[PDB]
């Protein structure tokens, strides 16, 4: 049978401390546990044994009655703990009023399942899983530490503070690890953090299992550089040993938890490989009187602790020949000059242990005051200590702990606490230490960023993709996870408005330089400047000068035989036509307005009509007198021709209303032109074409008949050239968007011809 | 204290049956359990009590020693089971050699944790979670049923067979639910099934909790219509009651598990709400002799079962006045005419129970044979039955079950088994029943689709995304389950590369039919067909005929002074010019090849050079005769003019060589054209322009020359016409492209202009 500690008393309290290590993977069934522990073992046992004596000596708490204890070894294993708990409850089948719960959460759950049947309150000091907070399943359980909900919140705050997005998660198999990592996963996935892969491993797994786990961790090495470890000390140590074996010292950042905390025994020997690791340690100041008591302990004068001699041998590698447990495995013998002071560290959760024991004692005390106030001792009503009443008192108890602060239990039996964020750093040459780099308390994370990463080149941010919101490139998520994307450039037509989605603008808009939202593209038009329009207006002005010169010559030589046969009225009509033809050039090249549009249509439709309508009748009169009514009748024929033309124009004007249109030929450029349908343009052109065809027929009929210096031949030349000119611009016109400019050129050419291949001869004669 | 069923024997085997219901959420701490169960309670208790006596009577198994039992009630609760297991082991602190493990997995885990410390083999009959398969943690645990891995695989097969992609998951709090749903989630997400949201709920949760769960289920109702339930009977029943309360009458399909199976107690009264539900039942044939024994049981003659009278009262609502357990709560009394035959169903897992009991018997038998071969009974070495040897024998034992098939245990203590898929259907009016609609064995899912959904209108496929595999439209995801997508059309340029991305192909490329890929665009060359090229070739051919006719005529009268106007060599240079001018049409209008693009440039640049060079020299001789050298110098001057032309054209040829070049005007259409640069076309054209303008300056002088048939006038006509015609094609050429065709027409006509006005005057004379 396993050995246990004893201490006599009126009320006997139980305790489960992991004096020995967890049983090896091959020896779990035998249920024998390995090496003795100092921080987790002998220190806690001695702490309990001394705090009990302190309580007994102190008259203000639990007066006139002694408090005894029964310490057993759980070996940090659920099965060993269950057997020891059976040994506790064997008396129920001096009673154990309560138990100071085991370190592990899963072990605590097993022990609690057994204890709650016998109404034995269990106060833990390091059980942190949220599962134990449920008082329906675990009624007789309290703890002097907060749950790991707060620890998961702390880890996620630390991860988000450094914008770590793509992390890898490891948690120890059990209840602490599983619950911790479930909480972390929830809160991280909620707030943008993405987990590369969540792994699990047993603390007592072999070397090969840790090797395989680390290989899987390296499978996402370049990107996922931070491993959030909701792991125990031994899991972290296993990962460190794996890093040693496979040569991975110093490219992973291990974000630990309370399992790792401040422990030197998890990073001794393997300091080089855990440098930079960030851990979360429950805040607990060193208990000074415990150190004063502990450091003076000697193996000769300490008999009440059955594991103290084994601890003495293990710590200082030696053999004590004067004791039954010689343990001749060790080579040397230890002289009576070795002390615990050399290389002494007090376990971080010592305070909590003392608090837990006090939490019980005060509880009993409160019950003592409430159940029989008068008697200063174990009254008749107290002989069978009721576990239910003790649970109630323990629930409502409050006092001042060894640390100094007050401690209380909430509705779920937890206790308020804060965390200290620590970083494992290298200070000197071959000297590594834990450095306090921040705190976390009720949601607020305070952290120095100078002590950790004393440079702008910190650990490579655990991000699965560079921030791709640089210009036209858009984020596409490949299903991998929200946090691993690739990148596709969005085209110039479209704009990005929300991530993952870029859409095209309608027809006359263009994206801004920032490439968010599209604005209105500036509208281009006929541009009074520019070489082409200025050349057009130059030609138009020269044309106008020629027209006015010709009209002057005509009007100052009226009764000259040169202009005798030619109907003066017909000539007037021709000159007016040519003038308005030239004018509509300026009427075209301008800022498109309604007054400009309607006038340009009338001008273009009328001027050819007005010129050629009189021209045809003139040629007809000549051809008829050759072939051998008229005068006024000639004028009325010309006038009815122009009348039907004007009727057609006004009809088209009414049918299709003239308005300023914003044409969009391509996706980039926008122009404004006045709404003139295909029919709206081709109708005047059609009519004028019929007119010119009739005119060429009649001119060809006349051809080269002798006249007043033979005008007919020149008129025929002009008619042929003007027909050619009209036909020339058709392909450039009817399948493009240079409407106005080419119309300007066309009309200017078609008038210069007439004003030239007519009159200009006559002017020469006038000069002669 | 709780009552326990007894049967005396030499070896006592324990059992834990859920005789009563689970304690209510309010009465958990008191640890009192509710109403008595028939299928899971009295039937299993009576089955064990009868199977043991059957074994005792049978001499071939366990001869000469009797097998007793101690049956206890676990009330389907971990705490009650743990206290009853403590009652089992109390004697070890006549020994309980083994227990027939409790029904639920979580309860089995607690009991196993306690039992393995005392080396008591535990054979379950319905514990199915995978967690119990781990023999490191649970060494003394065996089961006569397969693990939940196979069941999760069965559910995944069922969901994938009906293309249910977007399902919602519910699982009962515990281990069976938790482990089952983890397995389902893993393999489903692996294959492609999608979980809308995974919910968890306690079996004994209040009505409010089930209401909230169902509200959350309906929050994803239109898209997630299938709920995969890894739940117990009571969880499913709670969901059905919730559906009744807030009005669901066939809106969800509940895909159940072993917990639901074919149980009537989960759907009795609430049949309308579970119609269409598909469940998975472990295959086990009904044990007939159990029914024969059970149906004859009376409360008067059955004393060994302490719960039988309570069961009698609960089943047939009545009171037995003739027994101490009157239970006066019931109003009426039971007449001696009530039999269990009325409305009798045997629980689905009866076979497994009897197999487990037989398994323990056979284990003991094998040990008895191996340890004490000679002695027919408990030998001296067998008096303290070692649990280790028993576990070993139980592990290696195999035999024939009640069903008929052989029973064996694997390395993990499991047993082979197969599943039956059942569907809850309505046959008659107010008549609902479970129908076997399939089976599942070692990966093979064989299931009839006629009995379920006897029509083409089955349940709406649980998909959150209408399959938009309709050619052009692609899939884009958006922060959520990579399972629900929005469909966006890709544009005409691009093709779908992978269903999540569509990319644009090359400049000269187009997507194929059904958007499978981008192929090469056909080239739309200048084909010999079509009206325009045919007309061009017609004109070229008539030009050739005219040229050859003229050259014939010219030699017919070669020296005659009538044709001997000027150097007759010039009037051969011009003929050659016209000929090769026409010949260039063919090399300009054919398939663009290297040789043909070589020839076209030379032809186009060269022909006008020679024609107009000879013309200009002729005009120079005429102008000299008017001004009043000539002789043969004019040939050399024409030759040096051609020399400068050929220098220029060859220089341009060298600077930019004609090759095969692919123009891309738009993204859709492509052509093949020779890469004659803009400079390459404007430079020879520029020179020829200079030549023609000057040839007119000279013609301007020669208007009125009385000469040999007055050639000068005709040449002036030709020169004016050719200048005009060159001017006419400016808009169509520079502008709407159509380079080759327009050039063909231009060169074809400009010759006829000369050949038409220049020469045939002389030929006219010959013909007079
Ligand atoms: C550009 C376009 N030309 C015209 O649509 C057009 C319209 C009118 C005129 C004229 C005139 C004129 C000329 C002399 C006197 C007079 F009164 C009027 C020319 N071209 C097409 C047909 C494609 O060549
Ligand atoms: C289309 C284009 N025309 C030409 O680039 C071009 C080039 C060559 C000719 C010719 C000729 C010819 C004429 C007679 C005899 C002979 F041997 C050759 C015409 N146009 C422009 C100037 C825009 O009209
Ligand atoms: C993380 O937060 C933002 C990310 O854009 C950045 O400005 C900041 O420098 C990052 N690092 C720290 C230590 O905050
Ligand atoms: C979907 O289910 C039907 C039969 O239920 C059958 O077409 C096939 O199994 C599935 N089809 C697809 C597209 O997966
Ligand atoms: N909360 C932890 C406590 N703990 O675990 C370790 O490995 N060290 C340590 O302090 C647990 O529940 O296990
Ligand atoms: N398969 C369940 C057992 N079980 O759950 C029920 O609801 N009925 C039933 O037999 C388990 O493995 O725990």
**What single string gives the DSSP state of each residue in B647-697?**
HHHHHHHHHS---EEEE-SSSS-BEEEE---HHHHHHHHHHHHHHHHHHHH
> Positive or negative CA dihedral for A525, A529, A535, A541?
positive
Residue B18 to residues A52, A562, B41, Cα–Cα distance (Å): 45, 135, 5
Q: Check if the beta carbon of residue B20 is closer than 8 Å to that of residue B37.
A: yes
CA distances from B705 to B341, B567, B625, B626 (A): 141, 18, 10, 8
If you measure CA to CA, which chain B residue comes closest to A491?
B504
Cα of B700 vs centre of ligand 2, distance in Å, is 21
Pairing of strands B141-143, B122-124: parallel
DSSP-H helix ranges across A321-386: 350-371
Say whether A623 sits in a helix, a strand or coil. Answer: helix
CB contact under 8 A, A117 and B83: yes
Report which ligand 1 atom has the smallest distance to the Cα of A725. 24
| A396/A63 Cα distance (integer angstroms) | 20
Distance from CA of B731 to the nearest CA of A (A): 6
**Token output for B412:** 């993990």
Nearest to B114 by CA among B77, B79, B144, B147: B79
3-state secondary structure of A765: helix
Q: For residue A160, which ligand has an atom nearest its CA? A: 3
Contact present, B585 and B540 (Cβ < 8 Å): yes
Question: How far from B170 is each of A701, B255, B351, B538, CA to CA, in Å?
Answer: 101, 10, 29, 85
Tokens representing B314?
């609960």
| Cα B745 to middle of ligand 1, angstroms | 25
Of all protein residues, whose CA lies closest to atom 11 belonging to ligand 4?
A: B163
Nearest ligand by distance to the CA of A164: 3
For A481, the token pair is 């996870």
For residue B103, the SS3 value is: coil
CA distances in angstroms from B629 to A491, B47, B568, B632, B636, listed in the order given: 71, 143, 17, 8, 12
Whether the CB-CB separation of A17 and A40 falls below 8 Å is answered with: yes
Distances (CA, A) of B92 to B43, B88, B381, B389: 29, 8, 18, 17
Distance of CA A503 to the CA centre of its chain: 20
Neighbours of B509 (CB within 10 A): 16
Q: Which ranges in A628-758 belong to alpha helices (H)? A: 632-655, 678-702, 711-728, 730-734, 739-757
Distances (CA, A) of A273 to A168, A435, A717, B403: 17, 16, 102, 60
Q: Helix (H, G, I), strand (E, B), or coil: what is residue A676?
A: coil
How many angstroms does the Cα of residue B176 sit away from the middle of ligand 6?
7
CA distances from A495 to A516, B380, B496 (A): 6, 91, 22
Contacts of residue A729 in chain B, CB cutoff 8 Å? 731
Nearest to A194 by CA among A203, A205, A185, A183: A185
B730 contact A CB<8A:
yes
Rounded Cα distance between B459 and B253, Å, is: 8
Q: Is B613 annotated as a binding residue?
A: no
> Does the distance separating the beta carbons of B113 and A79 come in below 8 Å?
yes
Nearest CA in chain A to B723: A721
Helices and strands counted in chain B (H then E): 20, 24
Please report, for residues B291, B596, B673, the alpha-carbon distance to residue B655 in angstroms, rounded to integers and kept in the order given: 107, 18, 18
B743 lines ligand 2 (CB under 6 A): yes
Between CA A239 and CA A244 the distance in angstroms is 9
Give A255 Cα–ligand 3 centroid separation in angstroms: 18
Residue A126 counted as an annotated binding residue: yes
Which residues, in sequence order, are bridge partners of residue A170? A199, A229
Q: Minimal CA–CA distance to B1: which of B103, B70, B89, B80? A: B80
DSSP state of B488: E
Calculate the alpha carbon distances from B732 to A140, A462, B746 in Å: 100, 64, 11
For residue B702, the Cα-to-chain-centroid distance in whole angstroms is 87
Dump strand ranges (E) for B193-286: 194-201, 226-230, 253-255, 278-282
For the CA of A128, the closest atom of ligand 5 is 1
Whether A114 sits inside 8 A of B79 (CB atoms) is: no
* Cβ of B546 less than 6 Å from ligand 2: no
User: Which residue's structure tokens are 């003659």?
Assistant: B301
Indicate left, alpha or beta for B422 from its phi (over 0: left) and psi (-120 to 50: alpha). beta
Query: What is the β-pairing status of strands A501-504 and A509-511?
Result: unpaired
Q: Is the CB of B748 under 6 A from ligand 2?
A: no
Does residue B726 line the site of ligand 2, with CB under 6 A? yes
Phi, psi of B200 (to 5 degrees): -135, 150
Q: Which ligand is nearest to the CA of B147?
A: 6
Tokens encoding A70: 């029964």
CA distance B171 to B228: 8
Counting ligands in written order, which one lies closest to the CA of residue A604?
1
CA-nearest of A367, A33, A375 to A204 is A33
Residues 6+ apart with CB under 8 A from B680: B601, B652, B656
CA separation, residue B162 to residues A586, B167, B459, B462 (Å): 76, 12, 9, 9
Helix (H, G, I), strand (E, B) or coil at B746: helix
Mutate to test the pocket of ligand 1, among A750, A753, A758 (most ligand atoms within 8 A of CB): A750
Distance CA(B353)–CA(B48), nearest Å, equals: 8
Pairing type for strands A141-143 and B166-172 reads: unpaired
Is the CB of residue B362 less than 8 Å from the CB of residue B121? no
* B31 φ/ψ angles, rounded to the nearest 5 degrees: 60, 50
Cβ contact, residue pair A729, B728, below 8 Å: no
Give the C-alpha separation, B99 to B356, whole Å.
Answer: 10
Distances from the Cα of B160 to the Cαs of B157, B451, B461, in angstroms?
5, 19, 11
Header resolution in angstroms: 3.5
Cα–Cα distance measured from residue A94 to residue A9, given in angstroms and rounded to the nearest whole number: 10
Minimum-distance ligand 6 atom for the alpha carbon of B257: 1
A163: Cβ below 6 Å to ligand 3? yes
Yes or no: say if B150 and B169 are a contact pair by the CB < 8 Å rule: no
Q: Which residues pair with A400 in a beta bridge?
A: A406
Asked if A482 has any chain B CB less than 8 Å from its own CB, the reply is yes
User: Is the Cβ–Cβ distance between A505 and A493 less than 8 Å?
Assistant: yes
**Close Cβ partners of B20 (under 8 Å, ≥ 6 residues apart):** B33, B34, B35, B36, B37, B41, B73, B75, B76
Closest CB from B83, B136, B736 relative to A732: B736
Give the HSE-up count for residue A157: Cα atoms under 13 Å, Cβ half-sphere: 20
**Distance between CA B236 and CA B271 in Å, rounded?**
12
CA–CA separation, A352 vs A123, rounded Å?
10
Which residues of B fall within a CB distance of 8 Å from A31? Answer: 117
- CB-CB contact of B273 with B254 (8 Å): no
H or E element: which one contains A200?
A: strand A194-201
List for chain A the helix, strand, coil content (%; round to 5): 45, 15, 40
Q: Under 8 Å CB-to-CB from A577, ≥6 apart: which residues?
A: A607, A608, A609, A610, A611, A612, A614
All residues of chain B having their beta carbon less than 8 Å from the beta carbon of residue A721 are: 724
Q: DSSP class of residue B460?
A: P
Of A82, A501, A727, the CB nearest to B114: A82
- Pocket lining for ligand 4, CB < 6 angstroms: B 162-163
> Which residues of B are less than 8 Å from A724 in CB distance?
724, 728
CA-CA distance, B174 to A136, in Å (whole number)?
14
Tokens (6 digits) for B485? 């997508």
Contacts of A398 (CB under 8 A, 6+ apart): A406, A407, A408
Residue A718, both tokens: 């002009």
Task: Measure in Å the smallest separation between the Cα of A136 and chain B Cα atoms.
Answer: 7
Alpha carbons B161 and B166: distance in angstroms, whole number? 13
Tell me how many degrees the CA angle A401-A407-A408 measures, rounded to the nearest 5.
145
Tell if the CB–CB gap between A732 and B728 is shorter than 8 Å.
no
Cα separation, B97 vs B91, whole angstroms: 11
Contact status, residue B166 vs residue B194, Cβ threshold 8 Å: yes
Indicate yes or no: CB of B139 within 8 angstroms of CB of A736: no
Q: Alpha-carbon Rg of chain A, whole angstroms?
A: 53
Task: Give me the numbers of helices (H) and strands (E) for chain A, helices first please.
Answer: 20, 23
A105 known member of a binding site: yes
Within B222-294, where are the H helices?
Answer: 233-245, 288-294
């Amino acid at each position: 049978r396993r050995v246990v500690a004893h201490m006599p008393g009126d009320i006997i309290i139980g305790a489960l401390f992991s004096v020995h290590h967890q049983p090896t993977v091959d020896k779990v069934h035998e249920r024998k546990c390995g090496a003795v522990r100092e921080q987790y073992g002998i220190q806690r046992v001695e702490a309990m044994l001394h705090t009990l004596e302190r309580i007994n000596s102190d008259p203000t708490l639990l007066p006139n009655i002694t408090l005894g204890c029964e310490i057993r070894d759980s070996c940090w294993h659920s099965a060993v703990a269950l057997e020891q708990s059976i040994e506790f409850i064997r008396d129920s089948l001096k009673p154990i009023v309560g138990v100071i719960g085991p370190g592990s959460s899963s072990v605590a759950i097993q022990v609690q399942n057994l204890l709650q049947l016998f109404n034995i309150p269990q106060i833990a000091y390091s059980a942190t899983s949220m599962d134990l907070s449920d008082k329906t399943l675990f009624k007789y359980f309290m703890r002097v530490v907060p749950s790991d909900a707060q620890q998961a919140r702390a880890m996620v705050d630390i991860v988000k503070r450094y914008n770590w997005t793509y992390v890898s998660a490891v948690h120890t198999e059990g209840n602490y690890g599983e619950s911790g990592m479930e909480a972390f996963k929830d809160m991280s996935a909620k707030e943008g953090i993405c987990i590369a892969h969540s792994y699990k491993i047993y603390s007592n797994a072999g070397e090969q299992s840790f090797d395989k786990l680390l290989k899987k961790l390296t499978s996402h090495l370049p990107k996922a550089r931070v491993v959030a470890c909701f792991c125990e000390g031994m899991t972290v140590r296993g990962l460190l040993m794996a890093m040693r074996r496979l040569g991975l010292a110093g490219e992973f950042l291990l974000l630990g938890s309370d399992g790792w905390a401040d422990r030197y025994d998890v990073t001794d020997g393997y300091q080089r490989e855990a440098v930079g690791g960030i851990t979360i340690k429950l805040q607990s100041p060193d208990v000074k009187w415990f150190d004063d008591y502990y450091l003076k302990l000697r193996p000769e004068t300490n008999l009440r602790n059955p594991w103290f001699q084994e601890f003495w041998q293990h710590r200082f590698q030696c053999r004590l020949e004067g004791f039954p447990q010689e343990n001749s495995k060790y080579n040397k013998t230890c002289n009576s000059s070795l002390t615990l002071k050399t290389h002494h560290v007090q376990d971080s959760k010592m305070g909590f242990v003392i608090n837990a024991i006090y939490s019980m004692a005060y509880g009993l005390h409160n019950m003592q005051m409430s159940l029989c106030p008068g008697y200063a001792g174990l009254c008749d009503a107290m002989k069978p200590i009721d576990g239910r009443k003790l649970l109630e008192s323990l629930m409502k108890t409050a006092f001042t702990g060894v640390s100094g602060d007050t401690i209380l239990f909430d509705e779920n039996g937890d206790s308020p606490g804060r965390y200290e964020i620590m970083n494992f750093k290298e200070m000197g040459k071959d000297y590594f230490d834990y450095i306090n780099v921040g705190s976390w308390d009720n949601g607020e994370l305070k952290m120095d960023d100078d002590e950790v990463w004393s440079k702008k080149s910190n650990i490579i941010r655990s991000v699965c993709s560079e921030p791709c919101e640089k210009g036209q490139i858009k984020v596409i998520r490949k299903g991998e996870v929200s946090c691993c994307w690739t990148c596709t450039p969005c085209k110039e037509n479209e704009y990005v408005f929300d991530e993952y989605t870029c859409k095209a603008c309608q027809l006359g808009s263009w994206p801004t330089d920032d490439l968010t939202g599209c604005d209105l593209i500036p509208v281009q038009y006929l541009r009074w400047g520019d070489p082409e329009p200025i050349a057009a207006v130059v030609f138009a002005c020269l044309g106008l000068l020629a027209t006015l010169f010709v009209t002057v010559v005509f009007i100052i030589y009226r009764d000259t035989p040169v202009v005798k046969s030619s109907s003066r009225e017909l000539c007037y009509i021709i000159l007016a036509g040519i003038c308005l033809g030239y004018l509509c050039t300026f009427c075209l090249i301008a800022k498109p307005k309604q007054i400009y549009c309607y006038l340009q249509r009338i001008g273009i439709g009328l001027s050819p009509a007005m010129s050629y309508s009189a021209l045809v009748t003139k040629t007809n009169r000549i051809a008829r007198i050759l072939a051998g009514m008229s005068a006024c009748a000639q004028l009325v024929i010309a006038f009815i021709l122009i009348c039907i033309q004007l009727g057609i124009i006004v009809a088209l004007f009414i049918m299709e209303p003239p308005d300023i249109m914003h044409d969009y030929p391509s996706i980039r450029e926008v122009y404004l032109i006045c709404n003139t349908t295909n029919l709206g343009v081709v109708a005047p052109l059609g009519y004028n074409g019929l007119l010119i065809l009739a005119c060429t027929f009649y001119a060809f009929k006349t051809r080269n008949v002798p006249a007043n210096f033979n005008e007919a031949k020149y008129i025929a030349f002009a008619m042929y050239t003007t027909c050619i000119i009209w036909l020339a611009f058709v392909p450039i016109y009817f399948g493009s968007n240079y409407k106005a400019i080419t119309m300007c050129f066309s009309v200017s050419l078609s008038a210069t011809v007439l004003l030239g291949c007519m009159f200009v001869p006559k002017v020469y004669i006038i000069l002669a």
